[PDB]
Coordinates of C-alpha atoms in Angstrom, one line a residue:
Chain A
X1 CA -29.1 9.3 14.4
X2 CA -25.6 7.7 14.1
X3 CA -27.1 5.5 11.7
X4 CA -24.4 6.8 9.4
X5 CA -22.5 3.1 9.1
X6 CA -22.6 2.1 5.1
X7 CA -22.8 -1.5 4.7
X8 CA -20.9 -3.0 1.8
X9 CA -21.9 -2.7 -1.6
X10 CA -19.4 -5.4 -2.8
X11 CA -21.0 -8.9 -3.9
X12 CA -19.7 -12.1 -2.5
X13 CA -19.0 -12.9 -5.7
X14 CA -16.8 -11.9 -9.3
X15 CA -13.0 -10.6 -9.4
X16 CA -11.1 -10.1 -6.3
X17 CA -13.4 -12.7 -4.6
X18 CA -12.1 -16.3 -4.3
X19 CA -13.6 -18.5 -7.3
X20 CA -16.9 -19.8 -6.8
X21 CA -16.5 -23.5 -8.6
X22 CA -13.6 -24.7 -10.0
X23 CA -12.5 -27.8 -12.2
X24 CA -10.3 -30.6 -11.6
X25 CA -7.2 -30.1 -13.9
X26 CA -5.9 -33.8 -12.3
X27 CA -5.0 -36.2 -9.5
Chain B
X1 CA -2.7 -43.8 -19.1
X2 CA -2.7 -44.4 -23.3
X3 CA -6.4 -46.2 -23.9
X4 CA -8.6 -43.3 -22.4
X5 CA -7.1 -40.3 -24.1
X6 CA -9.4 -38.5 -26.4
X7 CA -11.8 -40.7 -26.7
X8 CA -15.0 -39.4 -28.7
X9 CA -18.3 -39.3 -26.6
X10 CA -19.9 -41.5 -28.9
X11 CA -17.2 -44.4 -27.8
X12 CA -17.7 -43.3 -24.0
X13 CA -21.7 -43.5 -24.5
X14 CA -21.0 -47.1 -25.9
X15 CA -18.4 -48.1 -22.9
X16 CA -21.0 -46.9 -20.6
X17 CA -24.0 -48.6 -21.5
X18 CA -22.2 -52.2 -21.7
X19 CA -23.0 -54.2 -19.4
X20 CA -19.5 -55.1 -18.0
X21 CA -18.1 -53.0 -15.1
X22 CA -14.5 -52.7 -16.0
X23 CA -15.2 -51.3 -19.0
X24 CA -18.0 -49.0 -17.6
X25 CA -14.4 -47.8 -15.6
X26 CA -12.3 -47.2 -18.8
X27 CA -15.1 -45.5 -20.2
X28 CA -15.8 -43.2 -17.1
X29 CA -12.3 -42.2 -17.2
X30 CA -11.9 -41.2 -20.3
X31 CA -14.8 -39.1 -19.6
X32 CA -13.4 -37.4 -17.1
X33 CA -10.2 -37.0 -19.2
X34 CA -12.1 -35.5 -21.8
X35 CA -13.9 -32.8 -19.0
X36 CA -10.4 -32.3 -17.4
X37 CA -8.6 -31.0 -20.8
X38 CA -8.5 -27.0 -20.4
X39 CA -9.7 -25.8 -23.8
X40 CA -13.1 -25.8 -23.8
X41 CA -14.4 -29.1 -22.2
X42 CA -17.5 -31.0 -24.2
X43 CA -19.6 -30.5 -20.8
X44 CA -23.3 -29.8 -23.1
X45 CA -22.3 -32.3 -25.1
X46 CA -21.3 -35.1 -21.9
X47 CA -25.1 -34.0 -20.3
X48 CA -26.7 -34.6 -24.1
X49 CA -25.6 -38.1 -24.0
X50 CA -27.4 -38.8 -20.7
X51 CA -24.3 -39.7 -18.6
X52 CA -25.1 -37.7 -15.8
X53 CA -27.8 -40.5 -14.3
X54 CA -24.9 -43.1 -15.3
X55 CA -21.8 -41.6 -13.5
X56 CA -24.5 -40.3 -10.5
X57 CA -24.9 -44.6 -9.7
X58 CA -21.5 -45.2 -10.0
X59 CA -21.5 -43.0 -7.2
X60 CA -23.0 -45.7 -5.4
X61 CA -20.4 -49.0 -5.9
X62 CA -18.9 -48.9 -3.2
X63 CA -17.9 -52.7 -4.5
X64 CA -15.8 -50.6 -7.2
X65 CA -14.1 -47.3 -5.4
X66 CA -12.1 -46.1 -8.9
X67 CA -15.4 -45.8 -11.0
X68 CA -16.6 -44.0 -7.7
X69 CA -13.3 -41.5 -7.9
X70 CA -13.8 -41.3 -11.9
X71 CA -17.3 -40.4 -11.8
X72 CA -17.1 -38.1 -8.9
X73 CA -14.3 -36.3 -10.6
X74 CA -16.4 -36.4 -13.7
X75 CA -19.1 -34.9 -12.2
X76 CA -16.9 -32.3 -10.5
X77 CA -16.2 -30.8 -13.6
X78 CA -19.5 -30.6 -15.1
X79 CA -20.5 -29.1 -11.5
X80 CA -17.6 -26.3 -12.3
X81 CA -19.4 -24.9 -15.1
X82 CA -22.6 -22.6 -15.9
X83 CA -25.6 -22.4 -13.8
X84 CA -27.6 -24.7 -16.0
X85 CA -24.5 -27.6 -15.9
X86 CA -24.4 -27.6 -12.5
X87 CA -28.3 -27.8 -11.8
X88 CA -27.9 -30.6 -14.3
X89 CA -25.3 -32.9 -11.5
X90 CA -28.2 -31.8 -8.9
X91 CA -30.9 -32.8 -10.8
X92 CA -29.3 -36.2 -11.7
X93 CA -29.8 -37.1 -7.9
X94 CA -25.6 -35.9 -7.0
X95 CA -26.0 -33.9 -3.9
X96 CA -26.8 -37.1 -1.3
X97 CA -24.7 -39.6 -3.5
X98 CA -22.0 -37.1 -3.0
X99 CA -22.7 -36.3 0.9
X100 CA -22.4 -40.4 1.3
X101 CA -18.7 -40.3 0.0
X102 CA -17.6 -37.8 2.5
X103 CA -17.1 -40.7 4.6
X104 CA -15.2 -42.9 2.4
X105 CA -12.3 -44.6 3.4
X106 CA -10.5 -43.5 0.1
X107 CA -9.1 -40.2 1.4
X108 CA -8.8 -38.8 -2.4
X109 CA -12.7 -39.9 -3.1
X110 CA -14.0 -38.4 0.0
X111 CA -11.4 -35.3 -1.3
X112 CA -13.2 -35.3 -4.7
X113 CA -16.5 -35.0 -3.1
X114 CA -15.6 -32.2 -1.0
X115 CA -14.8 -30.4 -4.3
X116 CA -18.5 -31.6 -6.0
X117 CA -20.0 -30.0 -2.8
X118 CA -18.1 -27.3 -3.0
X119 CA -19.0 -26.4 -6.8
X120 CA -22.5 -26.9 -5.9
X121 CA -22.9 -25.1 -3.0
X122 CA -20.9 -21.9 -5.0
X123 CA -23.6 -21.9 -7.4
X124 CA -25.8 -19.5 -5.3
X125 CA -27.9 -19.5 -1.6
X126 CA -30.5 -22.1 -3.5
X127 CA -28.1 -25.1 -3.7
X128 CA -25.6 -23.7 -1.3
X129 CA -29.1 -24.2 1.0
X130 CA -30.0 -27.6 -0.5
X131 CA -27.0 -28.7 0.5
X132 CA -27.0 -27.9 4.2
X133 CA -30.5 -29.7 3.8
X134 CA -29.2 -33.0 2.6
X135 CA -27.0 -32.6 5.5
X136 CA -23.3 -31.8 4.1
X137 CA -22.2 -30.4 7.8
X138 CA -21.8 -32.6 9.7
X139 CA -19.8 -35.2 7.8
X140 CA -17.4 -32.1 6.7
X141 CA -16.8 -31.3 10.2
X142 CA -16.3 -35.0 11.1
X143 CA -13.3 -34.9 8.5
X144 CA -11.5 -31.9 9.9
X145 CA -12.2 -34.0 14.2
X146 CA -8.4 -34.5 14.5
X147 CA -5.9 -33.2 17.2
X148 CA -3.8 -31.2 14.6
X149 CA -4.8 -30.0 11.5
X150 CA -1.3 -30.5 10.2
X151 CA -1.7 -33.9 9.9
X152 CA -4.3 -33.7 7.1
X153 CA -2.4 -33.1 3.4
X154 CA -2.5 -30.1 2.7
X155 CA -4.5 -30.0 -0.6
X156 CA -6.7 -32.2 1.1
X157 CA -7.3 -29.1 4.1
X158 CA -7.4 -26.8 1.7
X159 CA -10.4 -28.3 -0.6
X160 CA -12.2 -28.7 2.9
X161 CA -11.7 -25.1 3.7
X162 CA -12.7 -23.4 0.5
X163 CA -16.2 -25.6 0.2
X164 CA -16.9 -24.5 3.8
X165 CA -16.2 -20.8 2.7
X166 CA -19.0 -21.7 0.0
X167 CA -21.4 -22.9 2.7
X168 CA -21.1 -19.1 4.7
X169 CA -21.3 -17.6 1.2
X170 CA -23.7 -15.3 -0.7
X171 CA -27.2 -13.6 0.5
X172 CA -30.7 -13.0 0.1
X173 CA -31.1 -15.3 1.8
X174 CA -27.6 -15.2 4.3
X175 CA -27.1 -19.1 5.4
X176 CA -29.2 -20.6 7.8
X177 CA -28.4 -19.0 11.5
X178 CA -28.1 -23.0 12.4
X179 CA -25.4 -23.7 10.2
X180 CA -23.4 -20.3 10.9
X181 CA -23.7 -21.5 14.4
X182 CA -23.0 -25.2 13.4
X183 CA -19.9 -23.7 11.1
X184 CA -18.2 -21.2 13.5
X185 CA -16.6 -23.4 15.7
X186 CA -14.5 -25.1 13.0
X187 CA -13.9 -21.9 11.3
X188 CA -12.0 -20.6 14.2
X189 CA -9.8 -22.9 14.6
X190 CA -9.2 -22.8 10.4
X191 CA -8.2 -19.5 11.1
X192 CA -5.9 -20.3 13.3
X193 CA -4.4 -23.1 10.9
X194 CA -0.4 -21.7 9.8
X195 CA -1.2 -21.9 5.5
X196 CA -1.9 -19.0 4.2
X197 CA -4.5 -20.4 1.7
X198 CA -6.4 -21.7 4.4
X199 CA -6.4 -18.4 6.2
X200 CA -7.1 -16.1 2.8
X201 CA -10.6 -18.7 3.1
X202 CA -11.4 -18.4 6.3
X203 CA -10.9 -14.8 5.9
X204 CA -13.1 -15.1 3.5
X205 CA -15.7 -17.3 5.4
X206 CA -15.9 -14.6 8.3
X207 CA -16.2 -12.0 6.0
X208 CA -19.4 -13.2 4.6
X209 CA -20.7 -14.1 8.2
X210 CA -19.9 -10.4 8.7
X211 CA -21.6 -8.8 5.7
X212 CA -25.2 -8.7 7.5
X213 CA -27.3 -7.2 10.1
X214 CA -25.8 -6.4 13.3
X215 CA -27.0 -10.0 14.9
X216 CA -25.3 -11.6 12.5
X217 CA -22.0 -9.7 13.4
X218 CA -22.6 -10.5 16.8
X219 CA -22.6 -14.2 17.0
X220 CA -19.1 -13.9 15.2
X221 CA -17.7 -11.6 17.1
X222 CA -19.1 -13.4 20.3
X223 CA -16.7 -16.2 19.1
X224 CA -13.7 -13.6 19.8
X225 CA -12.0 -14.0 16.3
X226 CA -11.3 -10.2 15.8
X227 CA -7.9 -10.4 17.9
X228 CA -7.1 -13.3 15.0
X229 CA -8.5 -11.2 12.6
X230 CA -6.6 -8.0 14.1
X231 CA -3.3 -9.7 13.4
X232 CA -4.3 -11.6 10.3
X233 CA -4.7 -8.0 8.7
X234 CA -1.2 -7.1 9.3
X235 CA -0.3 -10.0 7.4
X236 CA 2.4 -9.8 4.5
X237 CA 0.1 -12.0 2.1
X238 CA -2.2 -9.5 0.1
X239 CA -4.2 -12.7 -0.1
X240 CA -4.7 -12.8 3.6
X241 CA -5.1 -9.2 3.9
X242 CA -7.8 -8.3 1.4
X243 CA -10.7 -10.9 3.2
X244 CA -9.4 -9.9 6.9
X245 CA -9.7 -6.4 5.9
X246 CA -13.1 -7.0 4.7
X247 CA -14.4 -8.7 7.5
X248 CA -13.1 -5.9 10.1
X249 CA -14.6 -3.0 7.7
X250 CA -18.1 -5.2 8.1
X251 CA -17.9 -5.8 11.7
X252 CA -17.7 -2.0 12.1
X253 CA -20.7 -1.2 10.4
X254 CA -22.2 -2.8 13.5
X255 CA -22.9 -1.6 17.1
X256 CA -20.7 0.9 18.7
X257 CA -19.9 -1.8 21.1
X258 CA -18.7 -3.8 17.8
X259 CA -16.5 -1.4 16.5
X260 CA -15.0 -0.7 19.6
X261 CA -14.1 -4.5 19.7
X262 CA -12.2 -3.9 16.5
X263 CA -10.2 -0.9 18.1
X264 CA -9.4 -2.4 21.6
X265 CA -8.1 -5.7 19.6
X266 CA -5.1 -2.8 17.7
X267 CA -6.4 -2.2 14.6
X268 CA -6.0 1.2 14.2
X269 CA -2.1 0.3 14.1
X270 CA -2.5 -1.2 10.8
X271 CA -4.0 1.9 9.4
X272 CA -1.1 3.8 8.6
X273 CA -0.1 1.7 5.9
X274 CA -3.3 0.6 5.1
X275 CA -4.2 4.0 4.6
X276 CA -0.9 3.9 1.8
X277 CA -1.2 0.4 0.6
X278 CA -0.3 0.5 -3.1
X279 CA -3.0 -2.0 -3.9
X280 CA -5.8 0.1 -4.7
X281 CA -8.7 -2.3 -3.2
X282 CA -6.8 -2.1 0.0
X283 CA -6.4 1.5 -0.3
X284 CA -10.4 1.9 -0.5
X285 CA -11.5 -1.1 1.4
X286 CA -9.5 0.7 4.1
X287 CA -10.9 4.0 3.7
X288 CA -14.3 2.8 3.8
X289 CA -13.5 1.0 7.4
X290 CA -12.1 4.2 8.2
X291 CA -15.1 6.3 7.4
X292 CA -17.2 3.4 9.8
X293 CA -15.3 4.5 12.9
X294 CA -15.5 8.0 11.9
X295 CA -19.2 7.1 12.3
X296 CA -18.5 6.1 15.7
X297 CA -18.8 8.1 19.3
X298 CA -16.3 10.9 20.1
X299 CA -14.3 9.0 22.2
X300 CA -14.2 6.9 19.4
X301 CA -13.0 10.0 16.7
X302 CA -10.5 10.7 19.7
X303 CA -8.7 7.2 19.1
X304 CA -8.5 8.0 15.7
X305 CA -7.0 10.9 16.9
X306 CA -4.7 9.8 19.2
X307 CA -3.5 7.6 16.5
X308 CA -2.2 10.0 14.1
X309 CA -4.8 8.8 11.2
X310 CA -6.1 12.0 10.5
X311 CA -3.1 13.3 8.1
X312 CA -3.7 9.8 6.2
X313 CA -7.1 11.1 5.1
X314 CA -6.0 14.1 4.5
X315 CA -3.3 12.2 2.1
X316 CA -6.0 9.9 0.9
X317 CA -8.6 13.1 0.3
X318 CA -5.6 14.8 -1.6
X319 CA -4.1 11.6 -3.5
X320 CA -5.5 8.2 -4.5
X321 CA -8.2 6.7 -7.0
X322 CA -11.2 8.1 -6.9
X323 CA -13.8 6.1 -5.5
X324 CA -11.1 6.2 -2.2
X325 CA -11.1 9.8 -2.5
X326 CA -14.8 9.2 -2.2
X327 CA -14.9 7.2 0.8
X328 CA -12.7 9.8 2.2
X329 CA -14.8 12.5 1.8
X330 CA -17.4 10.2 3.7
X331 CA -15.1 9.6 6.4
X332 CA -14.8 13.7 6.8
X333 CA -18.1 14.1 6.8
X334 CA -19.0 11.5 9.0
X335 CA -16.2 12.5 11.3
X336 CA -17.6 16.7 11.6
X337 CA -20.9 15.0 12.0
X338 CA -20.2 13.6 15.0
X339 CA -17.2 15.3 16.5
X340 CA -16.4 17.8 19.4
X341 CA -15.3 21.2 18.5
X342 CA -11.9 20.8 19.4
X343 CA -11.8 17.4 17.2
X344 CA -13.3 19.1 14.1
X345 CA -11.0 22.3 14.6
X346 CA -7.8 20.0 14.7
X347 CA -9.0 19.0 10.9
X348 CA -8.2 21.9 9.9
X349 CA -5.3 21.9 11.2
X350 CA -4.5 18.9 9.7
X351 CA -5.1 20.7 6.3
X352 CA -8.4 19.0 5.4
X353 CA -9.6 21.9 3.9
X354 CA -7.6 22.5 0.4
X355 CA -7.8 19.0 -0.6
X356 CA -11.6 18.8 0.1
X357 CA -12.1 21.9 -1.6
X358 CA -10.0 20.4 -4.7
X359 CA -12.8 17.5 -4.6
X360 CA -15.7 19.9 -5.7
X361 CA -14.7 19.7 -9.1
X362 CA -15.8 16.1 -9.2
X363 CA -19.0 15.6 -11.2
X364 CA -20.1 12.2 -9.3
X365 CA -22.9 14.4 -7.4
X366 CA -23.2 12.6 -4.7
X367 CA -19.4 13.1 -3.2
X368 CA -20.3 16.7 -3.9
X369 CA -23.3 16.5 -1.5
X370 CA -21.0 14.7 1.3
X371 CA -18.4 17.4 0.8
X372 CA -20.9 20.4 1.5
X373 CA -22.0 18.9 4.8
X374 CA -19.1 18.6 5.9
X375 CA -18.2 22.2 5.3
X376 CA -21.4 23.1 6.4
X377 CA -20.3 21.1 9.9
X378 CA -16.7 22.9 10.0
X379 CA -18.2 26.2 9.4
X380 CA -20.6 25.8 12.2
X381 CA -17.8 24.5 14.2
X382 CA -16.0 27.2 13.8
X383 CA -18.4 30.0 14.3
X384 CA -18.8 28.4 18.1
X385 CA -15.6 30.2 18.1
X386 CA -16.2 33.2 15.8
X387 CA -13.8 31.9 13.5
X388 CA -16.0 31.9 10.8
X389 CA -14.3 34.5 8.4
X390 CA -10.6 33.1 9.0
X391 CA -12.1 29.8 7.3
X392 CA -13.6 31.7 5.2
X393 CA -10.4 33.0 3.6
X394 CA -8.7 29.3 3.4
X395 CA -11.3 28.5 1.5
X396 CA -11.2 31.6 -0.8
X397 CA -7.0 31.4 -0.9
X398 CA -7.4 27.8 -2.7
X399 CA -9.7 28.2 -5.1
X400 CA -12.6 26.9 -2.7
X401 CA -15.0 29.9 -2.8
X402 CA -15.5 29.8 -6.8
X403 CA -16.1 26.4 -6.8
X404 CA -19.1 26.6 -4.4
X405 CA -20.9 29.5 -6.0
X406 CA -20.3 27.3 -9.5
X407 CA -22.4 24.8 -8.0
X408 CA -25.1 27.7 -6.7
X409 CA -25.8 27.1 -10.5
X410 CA -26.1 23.5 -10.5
X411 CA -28.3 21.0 -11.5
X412 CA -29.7 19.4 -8.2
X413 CA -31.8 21.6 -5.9
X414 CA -29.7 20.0 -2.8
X415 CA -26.3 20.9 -4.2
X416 CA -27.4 24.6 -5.1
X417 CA -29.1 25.5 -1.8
X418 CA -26.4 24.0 -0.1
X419 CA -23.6 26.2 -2.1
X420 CA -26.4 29.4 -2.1
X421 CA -26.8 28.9 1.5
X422 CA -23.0 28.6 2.6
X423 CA -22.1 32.1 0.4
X424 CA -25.4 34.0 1.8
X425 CA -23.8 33.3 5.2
X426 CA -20.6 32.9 5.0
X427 CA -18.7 34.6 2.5
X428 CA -20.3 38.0 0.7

């Protein structure tokens, strides 16, 4: 049909994507 | 700031187990100074001592709130690092302790916490789902209830943002419909919020929300963002840019009557220097959105149209990185697929057809496969006006021709019957 739309392949995660945990460097 | 510098975890362990609370604090502190340092923290060597079950009921003392900041921040840290350290904080009993500080009236302990959520919930769906079972929602929300954001710090707004972008993160399985549902709400108004690090989060909240099936689309779009998200992508912040762009690019592999949302809202403005934004992600993340509404209805192809976007594919198909040129060739062949006559012809007028042909010596064989449709599709076009032999000779006068019969000798049976069949018929 018009079933042509491509979903992304691109994961939520890795480079480009904002950091998945980060540490505390200080206060 | 002199007693708890480099301490050695054998002195922390000993601090720790005594049996007197101030200098359980000293020793907690140095252990978070010792996981704050930015070479290569001791965190295996913290979670071999067994402090984890210590610092997780200081948690508790709410009789003693700086053993409750050192140990959360503590714990933060180990929580920021592999898989394994961070199922270690969640198996030492954190996730609740850390849900009951959200409420704290020391606004840089319920801060901390925040960031433990947030570490835990980025681990992956599993704890980013454990937490939403504990019930880490509502008191997030309850911190963000005030008339304007912009009295919260703003380190404080951001923290809250990013662990909430956590909580809509990552698949198989998406995030509870509930929560989404629960979520949204707040997230709109985020995304209204003036910082652009809040924004870039949000961004990149909706554009997980987004990246699903068409239901999932639809219960953000029903909140009426894309307008927000329409004007965030014409923002000057690559930052903000890159998630808005992804979001709009997954709303329109949706419904027609999604994508048309995206169009009505302006985006096809934006285009024409998303279409030539140097950064390459932009450049393909664009092209891909691009080859989405080429996917769309005629009238949809006509907006396109009308917009002038066709000569920046053919500038894409003729000049960028390759995996754009790629999703350009998808957006061509997805555009002859569903186009009128008239729509297809003015491709070629556009000159679509020498930097396509220029494409068939790429060996990725699947672009190859999208390229011969859509020559297939213009040729048929065409010969609903007998103009099948003046194509013909544009695609011998660039070099087009011997490239398709190179590929009549080609290794996949669907490239060579598609190049046999398009000579046998339309060339000798």
């Amino acid at each position: 049909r018009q079933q042509r739309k491509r979903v992304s392949l691109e994961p939520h995660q890795g480079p480009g994507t904002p950091e998945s945990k980060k540490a505390t460097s200080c206060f | 700031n002199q007693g708890t510098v480099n301490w050695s975890v054998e002195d922390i362990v000993k601090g720790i187990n005594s049996n007197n609370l101030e200098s359980q604090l000293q020793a907690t502190q140095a252990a978070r100074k010792l996981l704050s340092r930015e070479k290569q923290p001791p965190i295996d060597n913290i979670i071999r001592a067994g402090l984890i079950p210590k610092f997780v009921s200081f948690l508790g003392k709410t009789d003693c709130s700086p053993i409750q900041f050192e140990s959360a921040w503590a714990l933060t840290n180990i929580a920021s690092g592999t898989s394994e350290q961070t199922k270690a904080v969640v198996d030492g009993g954190a996730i609740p302790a850390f849900i009951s500080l959200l409420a704290s009236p020391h606004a840089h302990i319920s801060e901390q916490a925040v960031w433990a959520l947030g570490n835990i919930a980025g681990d992956g769906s599993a704890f980013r789902d454990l937490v939403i079972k504990h019930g880490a929602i509502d008191p997030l929300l309850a911190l963000l209830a005030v008339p304007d954001l912009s009295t919260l710090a703003c380190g404080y707004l951001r923290n809250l943002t990013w662990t909430l972008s956590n909580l809509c993160r990552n698949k198989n399985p998406a995030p509870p419909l509930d929560a989404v549902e629960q979520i949204l709400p707040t997230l709109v108004r985020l995304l209204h919020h003036n910082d652009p690090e809040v924004l870039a989060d949000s961004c990149w909240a909706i554009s997980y929300l987004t990246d699903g099936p068409n239901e999932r689309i639809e219960m953000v779009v029903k909140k009426g963002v894309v307008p927000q998200l329409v004007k965030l992508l014409g923002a000057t912040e690559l930052p903000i840019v890159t998630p808005a762009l992804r979001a709009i690019g997954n709303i329109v592999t949706g419904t027609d009557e999604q994508t048309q949302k995206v169009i009505d809202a302006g985006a096809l403005a934006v285009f024409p220097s998303l279409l030539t934004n140097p950064k390459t992600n932009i450049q393909k993340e664009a092209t891909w959105t691009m080859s989405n509404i080429t996917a769309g209805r005629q009238d949809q192809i006509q907006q396109v149209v009308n917009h002038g976007l066709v000569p920046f594919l053919v500038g894409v198909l003729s000049k960028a990185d390759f995996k754009t040129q790629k999703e350009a060739a998808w957006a061509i062949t997805n555009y002859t697929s569903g186009g009128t006559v008239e729509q297809i012809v003015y491709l070629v007028h556009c000159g679509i057809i020498e930097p396509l042909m220029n494409l068939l010596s790429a060996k990725d064989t699947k672009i190859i496969q999208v390229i011969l449709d859509a020559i297939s599709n213009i040729f048929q076009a065409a010969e609903k006006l007998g103009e099948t032999e003046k194509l013909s000779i544009m695609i011998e006068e660039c070099g087009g021709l011997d490239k398709i019969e190179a590929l009549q000798r080609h290794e996949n049976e669907s490239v060579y019957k598609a190049s046999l069949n398009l000579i046998e018929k339309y060339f000798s």
